[PDB]
Amino acid sequence: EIGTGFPFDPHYVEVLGERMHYVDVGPRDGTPVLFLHGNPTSSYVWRNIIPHVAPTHRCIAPDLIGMGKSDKPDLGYFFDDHVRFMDAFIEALGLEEVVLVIHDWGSALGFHWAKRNPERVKGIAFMEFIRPIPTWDEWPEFARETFQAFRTTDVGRKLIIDQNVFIEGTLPMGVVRPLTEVEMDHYREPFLNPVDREPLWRFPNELPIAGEPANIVALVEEYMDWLHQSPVPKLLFWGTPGVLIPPAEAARLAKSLPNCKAVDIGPGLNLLQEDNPDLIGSEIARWLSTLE
Ligand SMILES: [Cl-]
Numbered sequence: 491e492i493g494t495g496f497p498f499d500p501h502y503v504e505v506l507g508e509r510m511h512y513v514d515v516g517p518r519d520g521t522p523v524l525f526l527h528g529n530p531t532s533s534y535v536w537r538n539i540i541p542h543v544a545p546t547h548r549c550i551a552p553d554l555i556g557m558g559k560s561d562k563p564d565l566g567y568f569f570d571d572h573v574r575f576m577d578a579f580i581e582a583l584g585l586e587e588v589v590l591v592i593h594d595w596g597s598a599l600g601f602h603w604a605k606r607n608p609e610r611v612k613g614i615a616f617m618e619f620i621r622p623i624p625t626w627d628e629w630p631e632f633a634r635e636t637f638q639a640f641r642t643t644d645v646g647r648k649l650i651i652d653q654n655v656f657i658e659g660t661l662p663m664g665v666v667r668p669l670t671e672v673e674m675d676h677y678r679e680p681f682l683n684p685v686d687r688e689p690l691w692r693f694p695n696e697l698p699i700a701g702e703p704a705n706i707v708a709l710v711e712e713y714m715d716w717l718h719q720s721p722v723p724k725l726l727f728w729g730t731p732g733v734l735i736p737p738a739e740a741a742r743l744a745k746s747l748p749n750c751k752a753v754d755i756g757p758g759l760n761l762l763q764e765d766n767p768d769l770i771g772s773e774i775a776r777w778l779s780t781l782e
Contacts, residue, residue, distance in 0.1 A: 492538055492667070492764070492767060493537060493538050493767075494670055494672040494673050494676070495537070496533075496534055496537050496676055498513040498515065498533070498537070498540075500559060501513070501514045503579065503582045503583060504582070505555075505575055505578040505579050505582045506574065506575060506578050508555060508560070508561040508563050508575070509560065509561045510552055510553065510555065510560040510561070510575065510579055510582075511533070511552070511553045511558055511559035511560045512533065512550055512551055512552040512553065512579070512583075513525075513533050513536070513540060513549065513550065513551040514548065514549070514550055515540055515544040515548070515549045516543070516544040516545070516546070516547055516548040516549050517546075517547075517548060518548055520546075520547055520548065521547065521587050521588065521589055521612050522547065522548040522549075522550055522585060522588055522589070523543055523547045523548065523549050523550065523588070523589045523591055523774075523778070524550050524551075524552075524580070524585070524588045524589070524590055524591070524600075525539070525540065525549060525550065525551040525591045525592075525596075526552070526554075526576070526590070526591070526592045526593065526595075526596025526597070526599050526600050527551070527553070527554065527557070527558075527593060527594070527595075527596050528593050528594020528595040528596045528597070528618075528693075529594060529595050529656070529689070529690065529693040529694070530557075530656045530657055530660070530661055530677070530681070530689075530690045530693075531557075531593075531594075531661075531677065531761070532553045532554075532557050532558030532559070532677075532680060533551035533552065533553055533558055534558065534676045534677060535593070535761065535763045535764070536549075536551045536591075536763065538763070538767030538768070538771070539591070539763060539767050539770050539771045539774065540771075541771065542768070542770075542771025542772050542774065542775045543591075543771065543774055543775050543778065545775075546775065546778065546779075547589070547775075547778055550583065550585075552576070552579050553680075554572055554575070554576070554595070554596075554599075554689070555567070555571065555572065555575040555689075556686070556688065556689040557680055557689060558680055559680070562686050565688075566688070566692060567688050567689035567692040567693075568692060568696065569595075569598060569693075569696045569706055569709070570705075572595065572598075572599055573599065573602060576599045576603065577603070580603070585610075586610060587610050587611075587612050588610060588611060588612065589611075589612050589613040589614070589615070589778065589781070590603075590604060590611060590613070590614045590615070590616075591615045591616075591774060592614065592615070592616050592619065593616070593617050593618055593619065593762075593763070594618055594619070594620065594734070594760070595620065595693055597616050597617075597618075597619030597620055598619075598620045598706075598709075598710065598713075600614065600616070601614070601616075601619070601710075601713035601714075601716070601717055602709060602713050604713070604716070604717075604720070604722070605712060605713040605716040605717075608716075608720065608722070611722050612722070612723070612781060613722060613723040613724070613725070613777070613778075613781055614717075614722055614723075614724055614725070615724075615725040615726075615727070615774050615777065616724070616725070616726055616727070617726065617727035617728065617735070617755075617762045617763075617770070618727075618732065618733060618734045618735055618760050618761070618762055619734060619735065620697070620698065620710055620734065621698075621710060621714055621734070622698045622707055622710050622711055622714070623697065623698060623699040623700070624700070624701075625700050626638070626699065626700055629699060630731075630733055630736075633733060636660065637694055637697070637699070640656075640691070640694040640695070641694060641695055641697075641699075646691055646694070646695070647691055650687060650690050650691040650694070651684055651687045651688070651690070651691055652684065654681060654684070654687060654690075656687075656690045656691075656694075657674075657677060657678055657681055657690070658674075661674075661677055661761075662674065663759075664733065664759050664760030664761045664764075665759060665760075665761050665764040665765060666729070666757040666758060666759055666765045667764065667765055669764065673764075698710045717747065718746065718747065718748075719748075720748065721748050721749055722748075722749070723749050723750075723777075723781055724747050724748070724749060724750035724751070725750070725751050725753065725773065725774065725777045726740060726743060726744060726747070726750060726751070726752045726753070727752075727753050727755055727762050727770055727773070728740035728752060728753075728754060728755070728758070728762075729754070729755045729756060729757060729758015729759065729762050729765060729766075730754070730756070730757060730758060731758075731759070732758060732759065732760075733759050733760040734760065740752055751777065753769065753770075753773045755769055755770065
């Protein structure tokens with residue numbers, strides 16, 4: 491059975507006058523592995539993956555601002571707010587060189603950072619990552635009406651903020667196997683208070699879809715141009731049928747991205763971590779092996 495426990499001792503660091511939570515496990519005598527979650531997860535999404543990596547590499551898994559066990563400041567929780575706090579989280583921890591393990595909005599933060607800091611990235615493992623969605627036709631059919639409603643200051647806030655539909659609906663529906671009530675309760679925890687749900691609603695409004703928002707669309711094209719031209723070692727997890735990365739997209743990228751390996755996880759949607767953690771773990775560990 492896939493583990494439901496989050497046993498990890500808390501760590502805290504002051505970043506821009508707020509306290510951010512993170513997991514820190516593993517030896518301090520090598521290159522650290524920075525795991526970045528997306529919406530609407532936390533470090534909890536990495537709980538069954540980090541045990542495969544910890545024995546050889548230090549594993550750092552922050553909760554983005556507003557999320558997991560990090561403070562809940564009074565921000566709009568824009569993408570740019572996340573960039574500011576994650577930039578400072580890495581400097582706050584004195585990291586020089588890192589390997590990145592990134593997903594969804596974590597892949598936006600990771601690829602934006604890697605583009606700005608090429609010389610400090612020794613590898614990127616990624617899955618179900620943000621690329622520009624030129625029209626709604628490129629967004630999956632089944633997700634199309636949901637996300638169109640989310641992108642309204644009236645209907646979106648009713649669903650996500652008042653009813654918490656991102657947690658109760660969107661989240662478990664991004665997983666092929668059924669999440670257990672214990673799993674749901676971990677993902678529920680940060681967001682028991684409705685006013686604390688602002689980041690859950692902002693992010694979908696920040697997705698780069700049919701040219702808007704303009705600024706995110708530009709930011710994401712730039713890190714894609716960089717990713718396409720970087721020689722950095724790359725490891726892409728994909729599943730069938732996926733959501734943000736269909737199999738066809740994965741195969742093209744496997745072939746075109748320099749120095750990139752692809753690992754089919756099997757049946758998979760958005761949260762690949764919840765469907766085959768053991769393989770994601772062991773492939774990351776084995777891929778770290780040979781970066782030496
Ligand atoms: Cl989102």
